[PDB]
Amino acid sequence: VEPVVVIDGKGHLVGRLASVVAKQLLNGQKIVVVRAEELNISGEFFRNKLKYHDFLRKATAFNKTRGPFHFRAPSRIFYKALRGMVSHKTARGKAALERLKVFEGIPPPYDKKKRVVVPQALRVLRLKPGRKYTTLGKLSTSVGWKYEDVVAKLEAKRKVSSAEYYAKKRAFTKKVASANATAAESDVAKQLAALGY
Amino acid sequence: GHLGFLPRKRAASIRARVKAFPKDDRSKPVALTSFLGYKAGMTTIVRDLDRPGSKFHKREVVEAVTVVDTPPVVVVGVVGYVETPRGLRSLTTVWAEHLSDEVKRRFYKNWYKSKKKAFTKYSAKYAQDGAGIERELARIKKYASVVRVLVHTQIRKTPLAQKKAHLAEIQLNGGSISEKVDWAREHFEKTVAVDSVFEQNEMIDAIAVTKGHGQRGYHSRTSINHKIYRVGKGDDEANGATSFDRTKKTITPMGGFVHYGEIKNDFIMVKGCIPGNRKRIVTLRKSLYTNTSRKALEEVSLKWIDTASKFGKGRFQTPAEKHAFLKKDL
RNA sequence: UUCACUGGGCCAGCAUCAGUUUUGGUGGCAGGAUAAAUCCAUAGGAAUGUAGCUUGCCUCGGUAAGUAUUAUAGCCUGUG
RNA sequence: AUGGUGAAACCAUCUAGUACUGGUUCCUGCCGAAGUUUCCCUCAGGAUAGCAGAAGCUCGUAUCAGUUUUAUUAAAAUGAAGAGCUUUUAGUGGGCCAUUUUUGGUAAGCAGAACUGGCGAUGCGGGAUGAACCGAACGUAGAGUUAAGGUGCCGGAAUACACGCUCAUCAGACCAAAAGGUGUUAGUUCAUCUAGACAGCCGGACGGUGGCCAUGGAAGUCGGAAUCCGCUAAGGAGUGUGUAACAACUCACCGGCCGAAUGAACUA
RNA sequence: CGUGGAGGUCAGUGACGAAGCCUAGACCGUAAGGUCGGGUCGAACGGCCUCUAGUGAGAUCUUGGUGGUAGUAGCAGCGAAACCACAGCCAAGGGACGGGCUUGGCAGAAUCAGCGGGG
RNA sequence: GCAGUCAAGCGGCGACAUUGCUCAUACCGAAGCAGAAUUCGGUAAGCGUCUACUGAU
RNA sequence: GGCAGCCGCGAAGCUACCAUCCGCUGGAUUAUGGCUGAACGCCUCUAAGUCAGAUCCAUGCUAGAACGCGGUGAUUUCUUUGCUCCACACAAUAUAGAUGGAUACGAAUAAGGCGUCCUUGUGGCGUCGCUGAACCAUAGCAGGCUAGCAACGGUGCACUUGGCGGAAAGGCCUUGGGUGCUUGCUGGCGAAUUGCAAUGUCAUUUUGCGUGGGGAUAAAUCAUUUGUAUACGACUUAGA
């Protein structure tokens, strides 16, 4: 329905978000993920942090370079989870992965475009109340990520100047509502209500 | 072997680039953080050790001290950088419109065969009140967070056949970045001296490429914690004299240095042996942090510096003293 | 020998048919404790006590403790 | 072996001699096993019985059946013309796994006698791959429903519904475990309870008596046997703290203020 | 189904082109194979009923020929041999064989010298 | 190992109790650890008596 | 010393625990000690919260993606005008796949959005969610040729003022007038024979040949030579 879907990873589960996005990728739908650094994983910090180290151990017994290497960026962590859910090493899998983009925060021009969320992957709607959860930001920093401060610092600048845009939009909508409200009850407006509009 | 340096492959280039600079100081006055020079052989010094609690306290001590040729440095431009999620990125760079022939040679390999059509359209950009130049500088002030200066050594002032100026970036420090870029504005085409960036007893570290051995040598090294003893104005006289000797001498030994010419510009005396053989370029940095120790804080009351010929066994520190030594002449 | 119809070859469209098969709409019937309920009645009963009344009572007459089986709400049980 | 060759073994025939390693050449259809029972004792080898074919004869069926029940083998149900007699004739003697009767046994495992099933000659789907696991016994095709497996992606199918259950610092999806855990959840048997259940504070917490003995001293509380008695509201010659010994605090035992369910052991 | 030859038969085909060979041309039969078109070619060959047999990918198979090894070793110019099913990266599962199977990660097109690590 | 009493319980069997012979380093917690030195327990397991690699295009 | 030898000093070169210099400073923390406080009206370092405190990550150093990335200067003529920017003229190569619009706050989810008020605050009042089944847009030959009405708004295109956006800004907005449409409203004509449908061809990235109008108009390698290099390669110097 949307040529390019932008998904906000904040408050989502990596496994649920990755699985949902993975199927869409195989279906030809292009998807972009933003604010990956704010993505969350179930369980308290120790379990998530401990499991990441265990995976790092089995990289390669003899030579890490002649094998896999560990990406510290939160986006790569999500990409690794999504990569395992796609038939990599194949033309269909490789082509599907090319339709996916992941960035920390909301780099432009996506900042000026609407972003959606997946209702069936939100932590609020999936995790039991009162249970502990882990955030990729702390996990990524604990494993050597050196850009958490930069992302947080410039993300506030993203948060700023957006409320101003909404503030102008909110005032503009107020004028539209007043213009629409006064125009209501007219002959055309009254007839429209009959047809449900 | 030490896995910290392996694999022991080739160095990136003859010049070594400083990978890290002093962190930041947004309150101190704007000043440079590094310098460039050449390995001007080595010499020996004798001084009284004022270190308390030492086995040789107040006693004379001999130590080999290296001398680095550091001719004045002129700024050709400035570089602006902006923080990004993927690391620092170079936003924009500007030039002084009058890059010296030595700098212009740095951009050409067959300099003689080339037409020598160096910066020309950018040079014409200065044909007005600076609207184009200022606007590019303005965005750096508006957007850039850390500013690095583009400077080159006055190779023409060194006894080197190269004449190809070495060009590298130096990171600035200080608050109110608007002042930092403004500081670079004044220094366009101007020269800077080591005395404005270093001082006696200050702790610094030097980075260079080690001597080759025709798989050995030719690797970058960053031996840290080297102490500066004397920063002499080589252009002035009595650079090799001392307060308690007060005899006019020159640091240059009789017959010069091995594989190096005379010294006729600013120089720095550094404790230890900076990596790299003679004729090798060395970049100077100040400790990467505010090191605080008795060894670093101790001052040096320099007594006498050896300036005898190294092409054999020396006897005198100057030809005038050689008068107390002739058929071939008279 | 000239077209000007058909036969002749490729792919399909529509109408109604016969076999297999999938998924909806709707109607008429026999059984249940001749479904059980609900509902309409009828005689009783207490309580997570309705109305009414009485013991302190600030919160302006408010409640928390009584008495009270329907009363200015209702419920359950027994039978038609 | 025969007949010759050269002197600091070879040549030609009997001889293509005498047998376990290897190979054994075009297509399709049908049928199609065995893997062991009888003496010569077994290592040696056939002759016979069987599995599968071919003709004839008799008979289509009271001819029977890897089927269900009396009786002391009639007969009643189901299924079928596939029933019987010779005559002769390729290949076949490995067995593995599981089940059962089961004797033997010491760290152990299991060994071993026999019986019945799967494989052994075997494709298909699932079991992430996999002897012997689950279903399913195959001509080439189109249509629909299923077996076992699954329905977050790889992976075709519901991030379906309902009820509970768990925080695990590699959980969970893969027998050394009898017991431990102030982990969690639902129950079983008993004790008390508006005469006031639990807990929290306060008071009482006594007389013989400093009970008898060792002895500088054991006054309840370093030690040895009794552990008696009166009133009490309940109080142990005293459960601990505590002193050189006293003293002092406390519980167990009741009482006063509070206000309902609480406590003890077990099962899952 | 196909081949060597034989009896009969088609008063068969054939220098205006029979045999053999090639065909990213076509047709027939599930198959052994058969037929047609084009190129080459130069003197014999085929349809059918029967007869006949020295009649149809591997045996460290025989003969003859041709590749990598290799323009390498070796003595500018000349110029081999051994060997060669095929490739020859890791953790785990592959029941007893991991070098081909499975779960994940890998891999430079191309080229080349040393420590010798194995051989 | 052999032999024997008793029993929390399991339903006649039986756990443990039961009788005879046969680190040198560093950081924490306890130790009559006055100090020094020291043992014990835990933590770090630190610390000691054709192809792998590498030069080059 | 012409010939083949040794001796005293003696560089350079080979070249060493056989000599000199150097070898860092912040977090998450475990064990452990505690604060607060239930589980259970006491208690408790723990279940909800939290401080100190060694293993891990950071600081620093080494290497730097044959197919990681950013900034900067230059970028070939009369080579029969080579190179490149712009408008279209025709062709080609293909489309991991348009067939109306990726419609922009943030924060919480045991709470928040929109309007209003004054007591500008964790304040009062009104009201919304329970999905986007939304909002915008949508009529005209694949969207024509023309006449009026009412507004002077809406909007395509080229000029033009000003501002914002450096994370991958490469885009986002505003003053001014110019020129078309305006289906906001009412009228005058064409649709055909694509014969009962054939996606019935209406966009996207790249390139060449052509014109017409603009701009700049160079370097590397080989060679000589050199050593701070060098097994051989390779790499670093200097020149009209």
Swiss-Prot record, chain A:
Its main location: cytoplasm. One of its GO terms (cellular component) is cytosol. There is a cross-link at K175 (Glycyl lysine isopeptide (Lys-Gly) (interchain with G-Cter in ubiquitin)). HAMAP family: Ribosomal_uL13. Component of the large ribosomal subunit (LSU). Mature yeast ribosomes consist of a small (40S) and a large (60S) subunit. The 40S small subunit contains 1 molecule of ribosomal RNA (18S rRNA) and 33 different proteins (encoded by 57 genes). The large 60S subunit contains 3 rRNA molecules (25S, 5.8S and 5S rRNA) and 46 different proteins (encoded by 81 genes). Component of the ribosome, a large ribonucleoprotein complex responsible for the synthesis of proteins in the cell. The small ribosomal subunit (SSU) binds messenger RNAs (mRNAs) and translates the encoded message by selecting cognate aminoacyl-transfer RNA (tRNA) molecules. The large subunit (LSU) contains the ribosomal catalytic site termed the peptidyl transferase center (PTC), which catalyzes the formation of peptide bonds, thereby polymerizing the amino acids delivered by tRNAs into a polypeptide chain. This is Large ribosomal subunit protein uL13A. It comes from Saccharomyces cerevisiae (strain ATCC 204508 / S288c) (Baker's yeast). The lineage of its organism: Eukaryota, Fungi, Dikarya, Ascomycota, Saccharomycotina. The gene is RPL16A.
From Swiss-Prot, chain B:
The modification Phosphoserine is found at S13, S145, S243. There is a cross-link at K28, K125 (Glycyl lysine isopeptide (Lys-Gly) (interchain with G-Cter in ubiquitin)). Disruption phenotype: A mutant confers resistance to trichodermin, a trichotecene toxin produced by plant-pathogenic fungi. It is found in: Cytoplasm. It holds the Pfam family Ribosomal_L3. The modification Phosphothreonine is found at T92. It comes from the Eukaryota. GO terms for biological process: cytoplasmic translation; maintenance of translational fidelity; ribosomal large subunit assembly; rRNA processing; translation; translational elongation. Keywords: Cytoplasm, Isopeptide bond, Methylation, Phosphoprotein, Ribonucleoprotein, Ribosomal protein, Ubl conjugation. InterPro entries: L3_arc_euk, Ribosomal_L3_dom_3_arc_sf, Ribosomal_uL3, Ribosomal_uL3_CS, Transl_B-barrel_sf. One of its GO terms (molecular function) is structural constituent of ribosome. The keyword Membrane does not apply. The keyword Ribosomal protein applies. Its main location: cytoplasm. GO terms for cellular component: cytoplasm; cytosol; cytosolic large ribosomal subunit. Present with 450 molecules/cell in log phase SD medium. PANTHER family: 60S RIBOSOMAL PROTEIN L3-RELATED, LARGE RIBOSOMAL SUBUNIT PROTEIN UL3. Component of the ribosome, a large ribonucleoprotein complex responsible for the synthesis of proteins in the cell. The small ribosomal subunit (SSU) binds messenger RNAs (mRNAs) and translates the encoded message by selecting cognate aminoacyl-transfer RNA (tRNA) molecules. The large subunit (LSU) contains the ribosomal catalytic site termed the peptidyl transferase center (PTC), which catalyzes the formation of peptide bonds, thereby polymerizing the amino acids delivered by tRNAs into a polypeptide chain. Belongs to the universal ribosomal protein uL3 family. Component of the large ribosomal subunit (LSU). Mature yeast ribosomes consist of a small (40S) and a large (60S) subunit. The 40S small subunit contains 1 molecule of ribosomal RNA (18S rRNA) and 33 different proteins (encoded by 57 genes). The large 60S subunit contains 3 rRNA molecules (25S, 5.8S and 5S rRNA) and 46 different proteins (encoded by 81 genes). uL3 forms together with ES39L one of the contact sites for the signal recognition particle that targets ribosomes to the endoplasmic reticulum membrane. This is Large ribosomal subunit protein uL3. The gene is RPL3.
